[PDB]
Structures are given as structure tokens and as C-alpha cells.
Design an enzyme around this catalytic site. Structure first.
Site: not given
Ligand SMILES: O=C(O)[C@H]1NCC[C@@H]1O
Ligand SMILES: O=C(O)[C@H]1NCC[C@@H]1O
Lengths: 348, 348
Positions: B269, B104-106
Site C-alpha cells: 500500500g 503500512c497499507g496492507h
Molecule cells: O502494504 C504495505 O505498505 C506493507 N505490506 C508489507 C510491507 C508494506 O509495508
């Protein structure tokens, strides 16, 4: 490394960071964020004056605590103040996704539980009394204590009465809705879920918000909702859907839509208070007859008519609501001065 | 009294209470609950083995932290582990409203911000590198540091590639939906919001969940979504709605529906990673060309194609995603052994 990580628990922000300490509870699944520190003193001779101060000066901080990311669309809070009446232990202003709020039953139950559990008052057996100045008036909290432990929290509410009975309103995009309008320390329109084609269950969550908010806005635009003594209390708090009981000993089920499409996970204590007033006026319950009401998640409160009274020109009751609350967190909320979402945001 | 109240800050539960300490952030509005303590050691030679241990043994605690009342339907978490690769600083398993999650990017951006801000790694200028074993593979975090302060957090993701291009699927109650399916450390179906009659705005929150989850379930039932090397990664993570950009310099807007109707408040992300793979394969962006993608709340990430590569039989890219995160709380979560909702509940 795992020590470094744990030691992050003792990380201290820069001195220009806002710090707000809270104790979080749930009552029948409904959160209460109790503010312990980080607010200034709240001037005002009455709770309604204190509530006006908060609304006019400190609504950014209400958002910072109730809204994402520190809260969510269904978060609920309490500001504890000095009492303003001769006999009260403390005063309180509630808060939710839309603003600083009047009286709330789930929150009263939580405050009673923590007062005894956390030793702010002596744990007297079999009953400890705490008095609370709410925006609606004086609330009497009766905590049942055995062997120094809380068994249950009750409160006796402000006088609760029926405002309107068996009204019909045309709801745009919905059709004809039958409702009772009653006061239980807040004003609610009661509607029958099954008659509207809904159930008081999780699978109808979205439809309960949508239909409840349309019913609410329709009644607000068509009916004067007058508190006999206070302009500030003269408004519709929400819509309560009445549903069939899931469990054999339950009377019925509530789903309260309030504030900005907020949903009560509890049966709603002001809701049970207003419901008792309706059932009593209709001759469907008697003084001292205890009933159990469910929520959308099958959590429960008890309700009972304590006595009859008058309030302005209305026949009224003193209702009793019973339940319990649990501590779920001790929070230190932090506001980074560089955070562009420091006062949060709203989605539902 | 106000001292009693403040002193509740230092109230300590009985010894039989579970205590879990966390550091909460938002990245572009999207929360990360970083677990500091309260979990046992997580055996496993690989991150996917560790993820299986958590899923099989500790899903009650995931609910306790992600679900109401301590969390909410859109809460996201991280378990930090010892690295399993030669060069990584730590390993990580993510978590959400449905389970223990892949990359997961965030969350990566938040962990980079905290690592430097809270002094777990030396703040090197202009760039600090941190390596992280994610369930999808090795992640390289590049924190831009100036005068000892984090300016921006970037990561370079695992190889990202297009699985399917310009497919159509019949979605019951919706009709024929056109999608691309790409991998950015998770698998996403990209659909055009405006073509389906939606906007990527708060006003459409409910409809984005409903339509996104129908698209997701339809694609999961009809299409084989195979990670070339790992069976446990072989599934559709979510639906991403592509919308027109609100702001002049923005490329486009994302709304990611994932897990059990969860909505990403960030641009996602892994989503930007998979989108860069699509735009690159379509010849719409070049190596080193930075774009900005918005979220449902108008928060932003940068994206850039770093280089070309292969992954199994696919043409692939290394994507760069850039953003920032803010600390919003230090939490001590408490589980009362008598709490009948100790492992939480789910409404959305
Ligand atoms: O930024 C991301 O990749 C994650 N944010 C919540 C759901 C994603 O997996
Ligand atoms: O129990 C109550 O009265 C409150 N619960 C949340 C909304 C209501 O005010």
C-alpha cells in the site's frame, strides 16, 4: 476502546464460517499443528487407508492449515484418529507443505509431551508409555516424568535399515554426489554437506533447499525406493545433509529437505532413526551408545540403537530418539466463505 | 477420547505463562497479526515516541509473535494504542521480521475491515471514516459499506512524493541498476524486474529476495534518504520490483523486498502510494484516474491520485489505495517459561 479491542477475543464469526481449532507446538524449533476439531471422521481400517481418504477428500483443508496465510512453507500438522491396532491409544496422519505424510519423529515427541502435560493420559513415573498407530506402523512413546512434569520424550521407531550404501549419482547442474539411502519410518538420501561445499548453517538455507531438492529429484528418477510391505511407503521423503557438529558433545548435524523444498528445523526424528541404522551397519556405534545430533539452528535430539532385528530381507534396528516439545499457541482458524484465498497459497 | 482431544481447546496454562491474544487477517495474501492483549501500556506523546518505547523495551515480544515458531520470516503485526492526535480513533505501531515499523497499507486495509466487520465502529453507509495515527502521520480510512457488509477498504495516505528520479547505482555482483526513489509513507527504490532479468512471479522468489536486498543495502550505503520532518523516518524501507501485468486491466506488478529479506505478498500500500507519486510527476496518470497493481501471487490493490499538495520542499500527492482483507484466525499465543525458543528464531 482497549476493552472493545480485547473483547474482539470473544468475537464470533457467522455460522457459515468453517472453524478449525488447533494446539501448536515446536519440537527443537519444528512446528506441529495438532488439529483438535473441525475435520469429519476419517474412515479406514488401516492408517494408510485413512491417509488415502484425507488425500482424496480433504486436501483443500490441509492447504488451508499448512499454507499461508494460516501456515507457511515450513508448517507441519497432525490429524489424530481412533487407533486401528489392538494396543494403540490413537492413530495419526501427518501433513506438510505437499500433502498428508507418513511417520515423523519431531511430531511424535510433541504428541507425547502434550498427552502428559495436558492430562490426556495419567502421568506415570518414572516412565509413561503411549502407543501410536503411524502410517509406517506402531510407535512406542516413552515419556520420562518426574514430580508430575515431563523431563524428556523418547520414542522407539518402526524397524530402521539401510537400503543402499555408498552410491554415486550424477545430479544435473551440480555434479557427482555420494549418498547412503536408509529407512527410519521414512526414506532419506544422506549426503555430506562439506564435501558438496555447503555448511549446515542458516547462511546456506537457500542453497540447502536448491541442492537438496535436485539430489532428491535425481535419486527419485533413477532409483526404485521399495518399502518391503507397502507401495504407499515406497518413495524418497527427502535429502539429509550431514554437517560437522558445532558443540563439543554433538556427533553431527542434520538438515532435512523434504516435501516441496520444506526444511526441518529439528534434527528430524525419522532422520536420526535412519542415521542410527547407517552408523550401526558401518560398525561406528554399538547397542546402548547414545549420540546427540544438531539441526540448522543448533537444536538437538538424542539417538540410540535399542536392539537388532530383521525387516523383510534387511538387517534392521529399533532406534530410540529423544527430545522435548513446547506448547506455543491455541489457535481457532476461521475460513470466511468470501475469502478468495480460503485454501491458501504456496511461495518458497 | 475425541472429547478429551476437543477439550484440549479449553486447556489452560499455568499462571506464570505469558498469554498474547491476536486476530490474524490476510490482505491480498499478506498477513496482519493484530495484538488484542498481553502488552503493557505504551507511553509516548507521539507515535514515534511509542515506537521507540516498543523498540527499546519490548523487542523480545515482537520476535515471540513475528518469528518462528509462532510466526514466520514473512509475518507482519500491529500494536493498537490510544490516539495521540485530536481527531484520530486510534494509534498504531506496525512490526515485521526486523523490528517495529512505520506506516503500512496492507495492514491499514485489514484494520479498516476488522473495525467495521467486528463492530468496533458503527457501520455507516455508503462510507464509514476511521482516522489512525501512524508513525508517518494521520491516515484516513474510508470503508465502503452496503447492507451492513464491507465491500472495500480505502485509505488516503500521508503526502507521497519523488525523492530521486532516473538514478543508477553500481550493485556489486549485479551491475548498474536504474531506480526511482519515492516516499508513500515509507521510502522505496523502484527497479524494473525484466531489465534485471527477473519476473515478478513465484518462480523468482529467491532471486527477488537476493537482488532486492543487494539493491537496498547499496542504496542505503550511498544515498541520503531524508524525511523532511522526522529523523526516525529517514531510511530506505525496501526495494520494489516493477513487472509487466499478468491481467488485461492491471497497470503493472509489484514485489516489495523489505526489512530483513521479507517479501510482501500484497502489491504494498505504501508502495502503490509512492508509485502514484512517480507516475503523477512523470505525467503518466491524472487526478481521479484509478489503476490496478498486482503482487507476486496476482492479488491486487487499486490506486488513485486524490489531489496535489506540497510536503516540505516537494511537489506531492495524496494517494488513495483500495483493497480488502479477510479474518483467518483468533490466536492465543503461549510462552512456556521453560521454552528455550520462547522469543523465536529467524531463517530465510
Ligand atoms: O502494504 C504495505 O505498505 C506493507 N505490506 C508489507 C510491507 C508494506 O509495508
Ligand atoms: O522429525 C521428523 O521425522 C519429521 N520432521 C519434519 C520432517 C520429518 O518427517
Amino acid at each position: 476502546m482497549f476493552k472493545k479491542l480485547e473483547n474482539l477475543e470473544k468475537w464470533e464469526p457467522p455460522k457459515d464460517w468453517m472453524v478449525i481449532k488447533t494446539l501448536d507446538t515446536h519440537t527443537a524449533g519444528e512446528p506441529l499443528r495438532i488439529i483438535l476439531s473441525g475435520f469429519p471422521e476419517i474412515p479406514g481400517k488401516t492408517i494408510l487407508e485413512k491417509r488415502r481418504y484425507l488425500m482424496e477428500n480433504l486436501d483443500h483443508l490441509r492447504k488451508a492449515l499448512m499454507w499461508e496465510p494460516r501456515g507457511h512453507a515450513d508448517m507441519y500438522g497432525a490429524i489424530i484418529t481412533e487407533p486401528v491396532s489392538e494396543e494403540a491409544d490413537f492413530g495419526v496422519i501427518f501433513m506438510h507443505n505437499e500433502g498428508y505424510s507418513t511417520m515423523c519423529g519431531h511430531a511424535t515427541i510433541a504428541l507425547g509431551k502434550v498427552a502428559v502435560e495436558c492430562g490426556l493420559v495419567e502421568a506415570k513415573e518414572p516412565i509413561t508409555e503411549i502407543k501410536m498407530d503411524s502410517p509406517a506402523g506402531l510407535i512406542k512413546i516413552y515419556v520420562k516424568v518426574r514430580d508430575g512434569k515431563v523431563e524428556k520424550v523418547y520414542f522407539h521407531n518402526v524397524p530402521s535399515f539401510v537400503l543402499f550404501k555408498d552410491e554415486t549419482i550424477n545430479v544435473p547442474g551440480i555434479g557427482e554426489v555420494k549418498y547412503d539411502l536408509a529407512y527410519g519410518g521414512a526414506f532419506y538420501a544422506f549426503v555430506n554437506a562439506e564435501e558438496i561445499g555447503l555448511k549446515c548453517t542458516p547462511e546456506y538455507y537457500r542453497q540447502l533447499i536448491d541442492v537438496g531438492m535436485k539430489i532428491k529429484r535425481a535419486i527419485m528418477s533413477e532409483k526404485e525406493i521399495r518399502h518391503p510391505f507397502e507401495e504407499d511407503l515406497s518413495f524418497l521423503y527427502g535429502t539429509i545433509f550431514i554437517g560437522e557438529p558445532e558443540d563439543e558433545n554433538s556427533h553431527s548435524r542434520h538438515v532435512c529437505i523434504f516435501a516441496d523444498g520444506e526444511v526441518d528445523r529439528s534434527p528430524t526424528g525419522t532422520g536420526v532413526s535412519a542415521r542410527l541404522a547407517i552408523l550401526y551397519e558401518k560398525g561406528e556405534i554399538d547397542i546402548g551408545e547414545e549420540i546427540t545430533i544438531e539441526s540448522i539452528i543448533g537444536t538437538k535430539f538424542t539417538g540410540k540403537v535399542v536392539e537388532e532385528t530383521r525387516y523383510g530381507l534387511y538387517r534392521a534396528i529399533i532406534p530410540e530418539v529423544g527430545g522435548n516439545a513446547y506448547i506455543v499457541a491455541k489457535n481457532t482458524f476461521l475460513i470466511d466463505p468470501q475469502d478468495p484465498l480460503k485454501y491458501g497459497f504456496f511461495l518458497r
